[PDB]
């Protein structure tokens, strides 16, 4: 079901096996740099979400190393790394040793994905800082061009993150909005009373 979908939940406690398989996973975890401890992040059931496809993992500070650990633990190999150069509306550039002009997004591959358009975009995003702590909307166009029309899932999204072809998970979303019939079935089956 192409339109946006989402599930308000605690990603720690949600049985993500009901969601099926995705060509792309994106996550912007609240690293303990409401957060999750390092063990909670290692323990996330990321491996069930894909057989063949890509993981996009925002990191910062010491999560640069921790995110690499999670990414490998979860079964991915890091094959690219996107940086977002943060600018204002005049295209000027806006840990303790250096001021941070950028944010990093790790890119991991699992399995053998086929039919993706690798090489269409480059690994640098230049885009205005919208609100605080928001990631740029360009990442979704980059991800659509790499894997058009496929199912994608975002972990730790917020209401502004919901997009067509995407299922957004986060505890600040308004309720449970699901349209994909296979998903609605397994959801009803695993949660007959509608409470995670």
């Amino acid at each position: 079901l192409f339109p946006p979908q989402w599930i308000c939940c605690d990603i720690r406690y949600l049985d993500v096996s009901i969601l099926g398989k995705f060509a792309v996973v994106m996550a912007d975890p609240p690293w303990d740099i409401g957060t999750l401890t390092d063990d909670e992040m290692r323990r996330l059931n990321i491996p069930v979400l894909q057989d063949d496809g890509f993981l996009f993992l925002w990191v910062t500070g010491r999560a640069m190393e921790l995110g690499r650990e999670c990414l490998n633990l979860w079964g991915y190999e890091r094959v690219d790394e996107i940086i977002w150069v943060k600018t204002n509306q005049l295209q000027r550039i806006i840990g303790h040793w250096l001021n941070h002009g950028k944010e990093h997004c790790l890119v991991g591959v699992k399995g053998n994905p086929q039919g993706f358009n690798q090489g269409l975009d480059c690994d640098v995003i230049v885009a205005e800082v919208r609100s605080t702590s928001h990631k740029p909307d360009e990442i979704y166009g980059m991800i659509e061009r790499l894997s058009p029309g496929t199912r994608k899932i975002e972990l730790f999204g917020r209401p502004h993150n919901v997009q067509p072809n995407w299922i957004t998970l986060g505890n600040q979303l308004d309720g449970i909005h699901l349209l994909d019939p296979d998903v609605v079935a397994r959801f009803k089956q695993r949660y007959p009373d509608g409470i995670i």
Binding site: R78, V85, V107, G119, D121, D123
Partner: protein, 240 residues
């Protein structure tokens, strides 16, 4: 700008613009404090890293990665076996050029193997204004930057360098990295491993296989940091 690059071939970084005038006094203090340039031809695979004394406050390490010639290359296997911890001062800094491939992972392994924690990830973003290639097999995206990892062991500037992409087969890294390093004021024993004739610079000891001349003498070099000059940051006045 991501749509635009897809449309035209202009990397998004082509449209960044513009890429506290006391920085000049600091730069002059750095210049007065700088040791004479010293340099040594040495085959670093075969060279006993240890002859390089005294212990360094800063190490800039620029091994010739195979990916720099996608148009002797050192593998991360070779690099990881360097005895960098043997010549680093107990409080010291490393700046490691990692490229944009496996280096971003293998270079972190090296930093931990030699005893450092990564504290900055300095990113060299390459514009292509003057020419709007062939990807790594594993690549998902087109690679337009290189990473220089900053490590610390023991107890003004941005983390971005923006220049135009060098001509094919030019391996030089932007000289701006030296400005970032020197502006940290981390001490005066500065070593550049795998530098070249073209990177020799005041305040630095350069050691690399392609140097055509040497002037290095360990006793002469150590005399620049003998008392009362052992602990200068490189950013204060000369001791009278």
């Amino acid at each position: 700008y991501c749509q635009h690059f897809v449309d035209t071939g202009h990397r998004p970084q082509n449209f960044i613009r513009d890429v506290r005038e006391l920085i000049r006094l600091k730069d002059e203090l750095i210049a007065k404090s700088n040791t004479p340039p010293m340099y040594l031809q040495a085959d670093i695979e075969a060279f006993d890293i240890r002859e390089l004394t005294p212990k360094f406050d800063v190490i800039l390490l620029e091994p010739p990665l195979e990916e720099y010639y996608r148009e002797k290359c050192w593998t991360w296997d070779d690099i990881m076996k360097l005895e960098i911890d043997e010549i680093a001062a107990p409080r010291s800094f490393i700046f490691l050029w990692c490229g944009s491939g496996e280096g971003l992972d293998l270079g972190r392994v090296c930093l931990r193997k030699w005893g450092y924690r990564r504290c900055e990830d300095i990113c060299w973003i390459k514009t292509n204004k003057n020419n709007p290639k062939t990807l790594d097999p594993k690549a998902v995206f087109q690679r337009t930057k290189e990473h220089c990892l900053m490590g610390i062991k023991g107890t003004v500037d941005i983390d971005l360098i923006i220049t135009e992409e060098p001509e094919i087969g030019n391996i030089e890294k932007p000289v701006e990295i030296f400005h970032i390093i020197e502006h940290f004021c981390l001490g005066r024993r500065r070593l550049h491993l795998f530098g070249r004739d073209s990177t020799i610079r005041p305040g630095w000891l350069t050691v690399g296989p392609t140097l055509t001349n040497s002037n290095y003498n360990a006793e002469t070099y150590a005399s620049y940091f003998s008392a009362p000059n052992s602990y200068l940051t490189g950013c204060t006045e000369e001791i009278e």
